[PDB]
Each structure stands twice: as C-alpha cells, then as structure tokens.
C-alpha cells in the first residue's frame, strides 16, 4: 500500500 508506513 503506497500510503502506508514506508519507514
């Protein structure tokens, strides 16, 4: 999911 936590 592009707008989930990318960290």
């Amino acid at each position, epitope marked *: 999911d*592009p*707008n*989930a*936590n*990318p*960290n």
Partner: antibody
Amino acid sequence: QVQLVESGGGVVQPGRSLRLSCEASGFTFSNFGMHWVRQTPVKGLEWVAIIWFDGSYKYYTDSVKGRFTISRDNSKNTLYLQMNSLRAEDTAVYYCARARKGQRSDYYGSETKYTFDNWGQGTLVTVSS
Amino acid sequence: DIQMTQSPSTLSASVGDRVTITCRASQSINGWLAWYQQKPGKAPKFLIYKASILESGIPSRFSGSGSGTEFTLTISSLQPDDFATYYCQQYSSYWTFGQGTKVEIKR
C-alpha cells in the same frame, strides 16, 4: 536538525538523462521513507515517486513510469532520482521529502495514512537544448 | 485519481482579518487532508495534517476543519508573514495537491 539538500539540476537536452542527489542529515536516513516532489510553474505541485526505508518498494506517478528511477544508498544518506528520456513536461523544481505519519505519533488505528514533510529547498531542472 | 480543488485562487485581506480557504476533494478521502504553506523563495512548509492537527511550532492563529470531502484552512488574525500560497494535499490514495490559494495582504 533535519536538513535535506538537493543537487544535480541544470539544462538537459530534450530526451537525455540526468541524476539528482538528495543528501540527508539530522536523522537516521535508513529509518525513513523518502519522496520526490516537483513544482511546475503552471500545473503546480506534483508527486513523482516514493521509496521505502530499505529500498524494497518503489512507487511512481504514471507520467514518469518507464523514465524515472528512485533509489537510495542508506550507507551514504543519499536519495537518488535517475531521470531518463526527459520531456518538456519535466522542467520543474524537484524537492526531496521525508515520509511523515499523517497523524500524531501516539495514534494507532486500522487505516494510518502517511504523507511527506521536511522538504528541502529544491533543485531546478530546465529541459532545453 | 483524486482531484483536489481550492477556492479562491487569489485572496486579498488586511492584517488582523479572518481568512478562510476551502478545499474540495473529488471523492471521500476520510480525514487525510494536509495543508502546506509556500512563502516566496521557500519550499512548501508542513502546516496542518488530518485536516485539523497543527504541526509543532505552527502559530495558534492557524486552524483547520473538514466535513468528509470539503476542508478549510483558517487564519484568525492575518499577519504580514502569512503572505504565501497555501496548498491542500490528500494522502489517502497516493499524494495529490490543489492549485493553491495566494493570500495577498492589503495595506
């Protein structure tokens, strides 16, 4: 403090290649996701690409797919945007931004969306022969 | 995609006046609306997230509200340094911005 610095802008012949470099300082670059944003004089602000903290996943906007590649060197605290097959629509000021939780840090919910803050000053790319 | 629409595109007002900017979403983005402020020569600055939560260090004169698809940024007392262009961004499905609203100051 948190400081993102962009570099690599100038002229590119229409239909050539250019690499941008975003330097990071003040935080653990290998812990945060990163974004590339651009601002055009007329069309305004436009998201370009996102990369995960480890570089596992990369998502792009449609207009740059097959032309741009977002990458990172977590050992150098440097973000990269390899721009290939540059068009006239690519003339813009390109910022790099750090990923940001679109809600207070104590929050824990089902749908927790993320945005990007801590924008650098930017690097202006002008596509001209 | 999700299209964001801001109104008006240019606004004039005096110091100490209340200023409100509206932001329309093409569909329901829940409360995932962010407001950015771009002053001349500077990059956009994170102001409000979740349509109402002010960022740390943002003056108390700024505020935000939302009702599903319509969101507003409000300056209770407009100040000289508040001259800027304010963009609203949704971070629900990808990240898209509005055209911006320039708040010029009448003196």
